[PDB]
Structures are given as C-alpha cells and as structure tokens.
Amino acid sequence: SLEDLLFYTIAEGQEKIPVHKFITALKSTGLRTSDPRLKECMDMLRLTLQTTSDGVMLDKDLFKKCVQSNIVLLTQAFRRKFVIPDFMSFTSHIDELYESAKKQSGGKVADKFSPDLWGVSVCTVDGQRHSTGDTKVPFCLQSCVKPLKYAIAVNDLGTEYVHRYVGKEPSGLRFNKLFLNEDDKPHNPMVNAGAIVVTSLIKQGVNNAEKFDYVMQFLNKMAGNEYVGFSNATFQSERESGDRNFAIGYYLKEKKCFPEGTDMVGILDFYFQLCSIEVTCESASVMAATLANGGFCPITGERVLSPEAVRNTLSLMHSCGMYDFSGQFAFHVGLPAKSGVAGGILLVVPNVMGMMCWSPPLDKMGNSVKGIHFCHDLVSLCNFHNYDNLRHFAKKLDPRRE
Amino acid sequence: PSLEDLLFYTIAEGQEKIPVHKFITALKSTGLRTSDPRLKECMDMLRLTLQTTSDGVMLDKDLFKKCVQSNIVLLTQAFRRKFVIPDFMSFTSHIDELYESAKKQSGGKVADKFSPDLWGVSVCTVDGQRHSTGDTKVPFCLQSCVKPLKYAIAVNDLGTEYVHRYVGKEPSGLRFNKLFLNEDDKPHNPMVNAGAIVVTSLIKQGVNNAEKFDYVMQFLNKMAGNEYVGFSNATFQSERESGDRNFAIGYYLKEKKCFPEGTDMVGILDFYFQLCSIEVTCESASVMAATLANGGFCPITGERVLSPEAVRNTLSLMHSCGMYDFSGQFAFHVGLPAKSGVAGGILLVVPNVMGMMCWSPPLDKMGNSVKGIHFCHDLVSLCNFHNYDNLRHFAKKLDPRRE
Amino acid sequence: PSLEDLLFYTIAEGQEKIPVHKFITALKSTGLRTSDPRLKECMDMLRLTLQTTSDGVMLDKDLFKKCVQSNIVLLTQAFRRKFVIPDFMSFTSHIDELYESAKKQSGGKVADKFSPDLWGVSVCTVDGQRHSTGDTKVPFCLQSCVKPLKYAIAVNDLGTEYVHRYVGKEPSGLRFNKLFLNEDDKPHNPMVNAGAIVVTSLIKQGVNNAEKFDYVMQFLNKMAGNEYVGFSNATFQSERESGDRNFAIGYYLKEKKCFPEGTDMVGILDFYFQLCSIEVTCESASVMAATLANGGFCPITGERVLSPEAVRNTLSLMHSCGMYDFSGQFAFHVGLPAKSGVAGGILLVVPNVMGMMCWSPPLDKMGNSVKGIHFCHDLVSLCNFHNYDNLRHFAKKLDPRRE
Amino acid sequence: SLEDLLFYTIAEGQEKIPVHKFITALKSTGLRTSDPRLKECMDMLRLTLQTTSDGVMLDKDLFKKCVQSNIVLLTQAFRRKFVIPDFMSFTSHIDELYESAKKQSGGKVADKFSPDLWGVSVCTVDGQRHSTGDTKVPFCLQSCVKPLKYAIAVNDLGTEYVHRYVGKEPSGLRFNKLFLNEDDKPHNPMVNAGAIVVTSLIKQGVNNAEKFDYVMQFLNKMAGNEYVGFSNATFQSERESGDRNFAIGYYLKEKKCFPEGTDMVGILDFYFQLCSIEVTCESASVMAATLANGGFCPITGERVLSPEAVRNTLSLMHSCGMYDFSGQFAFHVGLPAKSGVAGGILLVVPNVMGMMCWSPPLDKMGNSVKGIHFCHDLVSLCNFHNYDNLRHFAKKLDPRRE
Ligand SMILES: O=C(Cc1ccccc1)Nc1nnc(CCSCCc2nnc(NC(=O)Cc3ccccc3)s2)s1
Ligand SMILES: O=C(Cc1ccccc1)Nc1nnc(CCSCCc2nnc(NC(=O)Cc3ccccc3)s2)s1
C-alpha cells in the first residue's frame, strides 16, 4: 500500500485532499508537474478533473489512480528523500544568492546581448528545479560545448584513442599561447587547439551534415528534451572571425595532428557549428545535472554519457575549465566548471546538482562576473567546495542534512 | 532508555556473558585498534574489571555497562555499522591485492642507502579505522611529503589569505618545472622546493629554529594522534651539504625578497632541510593524511588539529601540484590529492573517507616511486574515490561507503 | 700623356707586334672573362680588327691603342695587378684545391630530384674576376636564399624602421626555433619564414602578384649582372601544395593583425612561394652574392642595385639570423654573412672581396650543404676572410689581397 | 738616408729643428710622448735636452741619432701610414659624439657615484690615442671584464678547450634568465653564468692570490702597462649582495659546469674580485685596441693575445655583448661591445681601434644611457659597422682613407 501510505500523509486525516492542495504540496518538493517522469500521473489527473465541472476532491481510490504509476518518485519527494530535502528554504537562499549576485555591476559582454540579463537555474541530480531571474532566454554554449563534445568523443572513442591526439594536462598561464605540447599534440580538449582535434574525431568518414545531427541528438538527450537550439547567426560569424582556429588547423595539418584522412577545413566548419548551439539556463542545468549525475539525465533517468566520459570531462573541467582562472578557481570554489564567452558557467556540484548560470558580462579571463561571484557565495554558504568536509564543515550550512 | 544495554545484544546476541576477545576481535573487525585513544577509558575499565577473575573471564550487562558506559556512542556508531567504510574488513583485502601487484613492478633507481624491495602502504579513515601491509613501520624522511603538512600548519595558524601572499596556488606546467618563480615573483605553489622553502619561513614567525621545530613536531604529533613522528639528523647532514640546487633557490628567493621581514634564509634552509628529514612511518603518516581527510579533526583522537580552511586548501593544492611533473597525468587518471617524496613516499588522501601513505625507495625517471605510482592508479581503477566519480552512477567500480 | 700606350708597351717585351691570342692569355690569367660586359666594346673592336687586317694577326701600338680605349681603365687595373686579388691565377689553384678538398665530403641529404655528386663553386670578386670549378652552369632554385635578397628589396623600397614595424631584428633563440611572434606580436626577423612571409607582405602593396613577381625578377636580374636568373614553375606549384606550415603562419599573422591593412594573406602566401622557386646558377648567383659583397653594386656591370642601408641590414641578419640554427656556430667560426637555402645553396659573401655561391644539393640535418659548410670552413682556414680575422697579424693564413 | 729623409721631411727648412715642434708634430700624429715604442728616442731627447739651457734644437745628426732606433715607427707616423692617417679630424668627431650623448639625461645609477660622470677613450691598432670627459676616474669594469678574461682563457688554452665549458651563441630575450642552455653549458662567456665559468678556467692549479696576479700580468700586457687597479670596497659589497651570483654559482656546482677541483665559493670571490678590477676609460682603450690589433698591443708592440683568442672574443661581444640589448645593438651598431653596470662599454672596431665608455646612469636594461647613445651615433658616422662596405658606404665617413 505505497499509494495508500502517501494519501494519508497529504490528506489531513479528513475527507480528502483538494486539487491544488495536492499540487502545492507537490510543488513544494521542488518537483515540477511537467517532469517527464511524472507524465502519466499528470495525464491522469487531467482525466479525473475532467469528470466534473464542479469539483473535485479525490477519494483514496481517485488519488491512488493517478499517482499509481509515479509513486516511487512521489514518495521520495514527499517523505523528503530528495538530495535537498528542505528544497523550500534552499531556494530562499539561492533567491538571496541570486539577489546579492544580481547587485554585481561589472563585466563586459562579447563583441550582442543585454547586460541586464541574469538567470540561474538549479537542477538537482534528483530533478528538483529552481530558477530565479531570466532563466528562459536562449544563448549559445560556445566553449561550454568543449566539455560536452569532449564527452561525446570519449563517449564514442575511448580515452586512449582520443588522447593519442590531445593531451590531458593544463599548460599553464604563460602557454595559453602555444598550440602543441612537446609531443606535437594540443595539451587538452578544453583549449581551442585540442577542441579542433576532438571535433576531428567525432564520426570520422561521415559528412558534416550528418555529423552535426549526431551531437544535436546527443545534446538533446542530455537535457531531457528541454530546449537546445542552434543559431545559424553566431555560426557564420564564428567562422568569418575564426582566423585563430584556422591558424591552429593549418598548423595541426602541417605537423599531422589530425587522423589520416581529415579534410581540415571542414573540421573547422564543424567546430564552428558546435559552438553556436543554443540553450537556456533551464535546459542547460539539466545538461550540467547530467554530469552531476554520473551521466544520467536527472529528469529523464536516461543514460546519456559513459562514466569515463563524464569523469574525464569533470577532471579536465577542473584542471582546464575556467581558462587561466582555472587555478584560482579550482582552488576557492573547487567545482568543475566550464566558462563560455557567451556568459555560461556550466557549473556542476557532483552528486548534488547541476547549474547553469547565465549573465552575459565576462571578465578579463572570459568568465561571467555574476556567474563567478555566484559560485563564490554559493561555496561560502554550502559545503560544496570539492574538498569541503561533509561532516566537520563549521559555519557552512549543508542542504543535504536536516 | 538503555543505550549501554542497547549495544549488549549486538555482540551478546541473546547470550548471557560475552568473552572480551569475542568483543575485541569484534572490535578489531570494526577496523579500530585497541590502542585507539578515545577508547582508553573503555580499555582501562576492561583491563581493571579483567582483574575480577584469574581463569578468564568475561563481562555481562552488569560489567560491560560499567565499562563502555563512558565511550558508548562511539561504540554505538562503531557497532551500528555507522562508520564511513562499514565493511572495512573486505576493503583492506582490496588494498592488500593492489599492494602486492604494485610490488612486482621493479623498475627504478634509488635516489642518491635503502633496499629497493621496500614497499609499505598504510590506511587510516576519518572514523579511525586502520589497515596496512608491507614495510609500513619503517621510518623514512618525509622529504617533500612534508610540504603539504607544513602548508596546513601555516594556514590553520595564519589563515588562507596570509599564506598565499607569500606562495602562489597553481601548478607550474610541464615546461616551467625548473623556473623558481611564477610571474608574480612567488614560487608557483607550496609543493615545489621554491614554495616549501617559502612556506617554512612563515611558521612561528618570531621564535628560534629549535622552538619552530618542536612546534612543528607538536602539531605533527597532534595530527598523527601521537604515533611516530621523528627526525633523522643523519639525512639532514647530507641534505645540507649536497643541497646546491636548494642553496640556489634559497639565494634566489632572498634575491627576490620572497620571505617575510626578518627571515634568516640560511637558517630557514636548515629548518627546511630539518623538516625534510622529519621521520615518519607509513603508519604515523596515515593519521596525518586521514586527519586532513577529516575536516581537521584527528580521527583517532577527536581533537580539532586544523582549521577546515586549512585542510581544504591543502587538498586543493595536493591535487594540482602534488606529483612533480606527473601531477597532471595523476590528477587525470587518479584525481586524488597525493604528494610524492624522494625517499619513496606518497601522502595520499581520499577526502571524507581515509588517508594513506605509500612507500618504495626506487624513484622512476620523474622522481615518484614506481610502485607507489602503480598503486594509486590501480586503486582508482578499483574504487570510486577519484575526485570526480559519481557516488550514485560509477559503472563497474566498487564503492566501500556502501554494504 | 701615354695612357693606352702605357698599357700597350707593358704587355709587349719592348717588341714588334704582340699577337692577339697572347694578349688573350694575358687577360684570361688576369682572371677576367672575355665576356665581361664592362669589356664588350674592347672585344667588338678587336674581333672587327682581325676581320679586316691580315693575316696573323699582330698588333701595332696604334692597332692596340683604341681597341682597349673603351675599357682601359679596367684593363690597366687588371694588368698592373691592381685588383682585389692581385695574383688571381694562383688563388684559383687554392680554390681548385678547396673545391677538391670539399669534393670528398659526400655526406648530407637532399631535400624532398637532382644528384648529390653535383658540386660547384663560382667566385665573383668585387672587381669582376671570375673563377669556376665543377658544375657551375647547372640551374637550381634559390628557396630561402631569397629571403635576404627579398628582404633587401623590401628595405631598399621601404627603409629599415617601417619594415621593422612588422618584423623584429633579433635571432629568435635556438630552442624558440618554433614560435612565430615575439612579445610585441611581431615576427622575430626576416630570415625566419614567419618574417619572410611578412616581408613579402610589404613589397609593392597594392599591385597584384603577377607584377609584384616581375618587379622581383628584374631586381634579381640586375644583381646577377643579367646572367641566368630564372623561375622554375615546377618547384612553385609543389611549394604551394606543401606549405601547410606557411599557411599556419599566415592565418596566425592575420589573427594578430600582423600584415598591413588590406592584405589578402592567401595571395601573399602564393607570392611568397614564387620567390622561393626563382632559379640561378652557381655562376649567376656569385654575381648576386658579390653584389652584396660590393655595397650593392654589381661587380660585372657597375650598377647600384641595392641601397647601402639595405646591404647592411641584409648582411647583418645574414650573419646572426642566417644559417638557421647553425648561424651561431657559423657566426663564430666562419664569421661570414652567409645564407642557406634548401636547394643546396650557401650564398656566401666575403664583404669587400667576393661573392660566392656554393652548390651541393645535399643538406645536413640543420639543412645546409655539406660541401658548402666544408668549403666555407676550409676557406677561412686558409684565408683571413673571417669577419674578425685580423688584416695585419693573422698567423699562418694566406691573404690573397697581398702579393 | 732614412733618418735624414725623416730629418728633412719634418724640418720646416730650418737647419736646427726645435723639439717643441717635434713633439707636437709627434703628439698630433696620435701618439703620446709616453708611447713605449718611442722610449729610446724619448730617452735621448732627455739626454741632449740636458746639455745646456735654451730650446733645445736638434739637427741632421742629433735628430738622426735619437730617432736612429725608432725611425721606421716615426716613419709611418709621419708618412701617414697609420691606420687612421688624419687622426686629428677623427678625434673632434669623437668629441661631438660625446657631447651629443652628453644630453641624454635619463637613467638610474645602481646601489654609488654621481650621475654626471661620462667619458670616452680611443686607441688604434697603431697606437693613436684619444679621450674626452671623466676618463681618468677609476671604476670597475664589473661586467666589461668577461671578454678580457675569456681572451686570456682562449689564449692560454685554445678555442677547443675553453668551449668545452661555455657555449658560444646568444641568449634569448624572454628566457634570458635561465642559467644554462640545453647542453648544460652557460649560454656564452658574457652572461654571469658563463663569466663565472670562464673564470675557473684561468690558471687552474694555483691559488686565488696568484691567479689574480697572472690576470693582472695579462691585464697589464694588454693595456701596455697603463692603469689597472682594484677596489676592495666594491669587492666587499659585491661579496655581500650578489645573492643572484651565489644562486648561479650553486647552480653551476650542482650542474658540474666548472673544471674538476674548483672551489666554487673562491671562484665566486675571484669573480667578485675580477668584477671589482679597476680601470679608467684610458687604460681600457688599450685593452680594446689590443683586441682590435690581432692581439699585439698597439703601444708596446708586444704580442699579448694569439689571434685565435682575439677572433673569438670579438665574435662573442658582437652576439652577446649588451645583455638583452645585444640583438638590437649588433643590428644597429654592429661593433663587438661589452656593457657594464658601472656604465662601462668596452667597444672595438677591428683593424682600426679600441674604445671604452663610462657613464654611471643605466637604462632599464643595465646599459649606460649615454654610453649607449654614443655608439649608435658613432656607427651612424663611420663605416665602422661590421658590414658597411669599404668602397660604397653612402653618406658615411671612413677614417682609413685620406
Ligand atoms: O603571443 C605571443 C606573445 C608572448 C609573450 C611572452 C612570452 C611568450 C609569448 N607569442 C606567441 N608565439 N607563437 C604563438 C602561436 C603558437 S606557436 C606555433 C605552435 C607551435 N610552434 N612550436 C611548437 N612546438 C612543437 O611543435 C614541438 C616539436 C618537437 C619536436 C619536433 C618538432 C616540434 S608548437 S603565440
Ligand atoms: O635545465 C636547463 C636545460 C634546458 C632544457 C630545456 C630548455 C631550456 C633549458 N636549463 C635551466 N634550468 N634551470 C635553470 C635555472 C632555472 S631559474 C632561472 C632564473 C629564474 N627563476 N624564476 C624566474 N622567473 C621570474 O623571475 C619572473 C618571470 C617569469 C616568467 C616571465 C617573466 C618573469 S627566472 S636553467
């Protein structure tokens, strides 16, 4: 009697629960009715609300009928088994943390969005969503895709083959300039140099039209079929300006850094496409949550990413993610991130939640100000630093305990 | 309404009396050692109340309740399977298996007195559970393993802002492994000779090169729960006459005023050289490591040894800058804050779980003990400890925080 | 008062009529060639005279006089041994030995269509005196020998400091063999391909490539005294199907705004490849070399091809940034401003003496002709031509400028 | 008739030649009365200017027997066979060059002299001398001493031996702070790293009080026995602050770059000594002109340096002469030169002259501000630049043509 136990808990020992009393109780687990895992249960309460134009409260049988298929989720949500149990106040802090971070004036956009925008969207490894501010506005990943594509190539080619072509370390702050390492390979897949070679490994032999759908599919599964778009616009402008990536390409060609059969100039076309893929904070925190969640999309429970692919990517998101800010960043926030010149910080606090912070203004290394100050405050407030202690964490509050 | 009685029927499964060996081999399987200092009252009472018979004997709800009365809740948790590694027993067997497979790979050159066949591994967890195997009671110099330990002491005592005025926090790269300073005219991080030597000059800013040392030993004893920390004046003598590279760094960091006001660079070099020949065994350093793995509370004494500021920063930097030039490949393939050492040492830490120390004197080309490098890989291959595994979805790996 | 007569009676033994053929030998052992352009009128009038007179033929003082009237100024200098190398006959003996001594050095690898036993030295002194040994009339491309010439042409047309808004003037630094731009986002110097490409980018901006090229051909023709200067279309079309590295450099230059505004980098790359495919002979290129040996004036025409501001900058960077990595050891040991080329050319230049081209196609590992550097070493072994050789006290060296 | 032929030429048709007239005829030939190759003659000018009390005034036989033994030297001088025939005009050019450089007011002295000191001095392959400014003030060569010591090493050991221990190429502008090159040899004998090493090659097997004599023996033969001194003061301060040099010293020790059995700390003391050697501009011109003269001292006719050692030392000064300024220096100036932190610049125009400039204030690169201006102007005046032609040199001046 799983459904049975759940009814008594929500229905205050009386005749029944009314309609919104269920859903306001359901919207308090931070779950969202449009969760794909709740599709059935929501379908069927459309059916039973349509039994009368007068009511209706629900009997224990009427209740149990709808939540039949989804009580596994509804129990964990209502007996507060979700990775952040009091999700209700945990959002009231993120609210504050959005608010104080909204007060951060500085930063320059790339050069054409409005520097007013600012939207952070949580998505817990369990599905609990929260968002405040402008989380519905689509934007491009740009270099936020290098992890995602890097994932895809290790997901399909394995680590050994891939790093036969790209390094694994960071190169430091004086050689954010060099292309190849001592062995005539770019140093890691997070710098455009290694990214160009990675792009040259995704689906060799197939043509550039088929190649691109293969990652759009992949990029869709990672966001639980929430909004991933494409901007032809930033695509064409991203190759007309891509003189540096051409440079890299030609130098990769000369010293033979692509697989034997690569039409180098096409691979750059493909690279440039990949950067112009669109997302919203909402759709992109599910992508981050997928990395948070070992490779499984938190709101569809589908496997998208092999764990090697997801480990390797958070590993290099750590070392190599925030450009030259990586060192200081891996230090104070210590959360595998990936910045993007569009302003996206594809934050991940693994085994908890995925974030996407979007506010377009950047800093001198290429990281959203508000994006960066938000993590800082976040780590300050909650024991999320990769090497915080989960037990003796002193003045920090944990949202995984009660 | 009977917490001391609550634990009785777990071992005395509905039995009358219970042998104390039946209780302590039940407590060696908790992984704890009888010499756990937060058991002493339980172990003194039991030694005392073991002076109530001369043939045996054993204890009852009368006696037990009088003895584990003091430390009941640790024995509760210890016996309610409430330790971070519940079946510590089979986890040790894993370590044994990695240890011996990492023994047969006999490449390397000893640095330039030991036998290359030495190979010692020791674990301690944040709950105090310990294990080891091989030559783990053999004292070696911390050498560069001392560096994060000494960093920690500086941050606990001075805060993170202060200590990173004097030494950067990033890893150097496979190019600049020989430059001393980054462009900020600081050594890149506390893990390079350049950076250690600098951190050393921030401990006990004031008192003299004998109080500074005792004070590091005091800390180093607290942190190790009072296991063997020591000091091999023999190494220190040869460290300080063949130390031309270091004297180069010393003179260059003085050249670029990298120490603080009133720093006797040459004496700091002695302290450094001293701190390098500070002796530990794999065992005593397991408690060092697990202490940092434990928010700064010493797992086997319950004593707050370090800031949680201090443990975090150190583990932040052992990750990046820990394995000389192999740190990159290391952070990738094993992604555990480690720290290598010229005598064979690796100070491994699995945060929220355990601390480790490995040891085989033969270094490889890079200067990291062959068998030690081999062993840290294999352990991440095995267990989802790698800093970036998922705790829920981790493929074909074994998590030992689960039964 | 007695000018051509002064010469006329010196080649005669106070005698009757000197035969034309023994005047011919007297002027071939002066080293000049009967085809010197600065002599064409003397040979025109003397073959015309053989055409009319009969039947020896022989030569009166009046029959000698103003055949040589035109070029007597040279012709005296030739005969009173007032040339830079007075006893040129013996000096060719030493070239004939140094050629043969360098003939035995068959090591070295061609680039990848010729044959390695090809070996030719042609000497053009600043006066005109020619000597060749071995295969001098075989045509080869200039390849990166063009860089100094093209560089000269750039500064002769645009002047040092403009050219150097876009190109440094320093020799990169043996291990930084590989980075294109320096700190200021400038290439290092015009001898490196990264600078060649940007130099090329600055000659006759605005014109299109067909004209640019001919503007370069005429220039090269005069420097050679209108001896063979040509263009193999064969090597150019592969120079464009293989220069991936150059394309690398070009785009990176574009990204950093290293070309002038309104530079189509892809055609500047094509123009650049054409300058490498220009061909010459040992004979034709020793006149090019002697031109720079000659403050820019072509020894066998008398024609100012290059500003002295441009001879020097080119000779400078040929000293220091010239022979690629070997230029250090080369500036040390040979101290001559040379320039290597991957076709097998060393554009040797002994300022104030002569211009050589040596040609053996086989390159060494740094890409420089085996026999070329051997000849070059042996040549300064025997003679005080090394840059900082002393012209007065020079030990056992022979000086050819002293009789 | 050779002494008569001389006696007749310098005679103004006057039967009894004055000696005031003789010496100003001699001084203005460049030579000074203190020339050692003229002592015999100058001795007997003291002998016969002792016989009475008048002029005195020599004649066909008195003249003849004083210049009897120095005639062929006094021939070329008065037959204008001296490499710079009209040395006279040549010196006021050097004067203008000095005064033009007089106005370059920038610069910071290191830390003790007063920053208005400035001098130049010339000496030719034949002996003609000139100086202007503060050219009799002792100062330390400091770093100007590395070429001189290198010569002595090559002269005593030969090119082969010496360059088993120091390289021969230039450093490299950005990573100009490395001590060694990838052969573990210091880059060249002109960096403190290679200087220090060159210093251990001199007179192995003999203690440091005697090494220093033999160096000054050499450093005397080379300056024709003009002023060579030594400062213990600067030696004790250089001893007490060159932490960098200790660094480098220790670094060469661990890298085993000295010849076996080298007391590093002593060689550092010897280095600190050798850098504290005292010269004036004057004495240092004969230093340089000895090198300009194939190793024969212009003023004593002694062979001091085998041409080997002279060739090499003037090659390395060209390449590695002026610290990070050497690249641009060899380009624009293209005379082998050698800068010093005191302001010293030991310049050399082979086969014509040696020079030496002093000016305390340095630039941002460790080179005398005005000592630097001075060359740049000099080469802009004379076809001295190593690659100016001796026939066609555009609008420049040649001082070997009359
Ligand atoms: O933007 C600045 C300002 C700056 C300022 C201060 C300091 C430095 C720089 N400088 C820049 N300089 N170049 C840039 C473009 C990247 S370099 C071309 C890519 C590579 N070239 N050689 C490589 N090594 C190998 O390929 C190893 C190899 C091993 C064995 C055999 C062959 C090859 S990779 S940017
Ligand atoms: O061991 C090889 C063979 C090898 C092999 C391969 C390639 C070359 C050479 N060569 C050497 N290896 N170690 C050597 C002594 C190392 S220390 C040099 C003195 C400095 N220490 N930190 C510095 N940076 C800054 O003071 C600030 C700054 C940093 C960066 C930019 C601007 C400003 S400079 S030499």
Numbering used by the authors:
A (entry chain D), D (entry chain A): 138 to 248, 255 to 545
B (entry chain B), C (entry chain C): 137 to 248, 255 to 545
The authors write:
Cancer cells often overexpress glutaminase enzymes, in particular glutaminase C (GAC), which resides in the mitochondria and catalyzes the hydrolysis of glutamine to glutamate. Glutamate is then either used to fuel the TCA cycle via its conversion to α-ketoglutarate by glutamate dehydrogenase or as a building block for various biomolecules.
However, the serial room temperature structure for the GAC–BPTES complex shows that one of the two BPTES molecules assumes a more extended orientation compared to UPGL00004, whereas in the cryo-cooled co-crystal structure of GAC bound to BPTES, each of the two bound BPTES molecules adopt an orientation similar to UPGL00004. In fact, the BPTES molecule in the serial room temperature structure also shows the highest B-factor, suggesting that that the weaker inhibitor (BPTES) undergoes multiple conformational changes before stabilizing in the cup-like orientation as always observed for UPGL0004. Examining the interactions with the activation loop reveals that the thiadiazole ring within the more linear end of the extended BPTES molecule in the room temperature structure for the GAC–BPTES complex is shifted away from its hydrogen bonding partner, the backbone NH of Phe 322 (4.3 Å distance for the more-linear end versus 3.8 Å for the more cup-shaped end of the molecule).
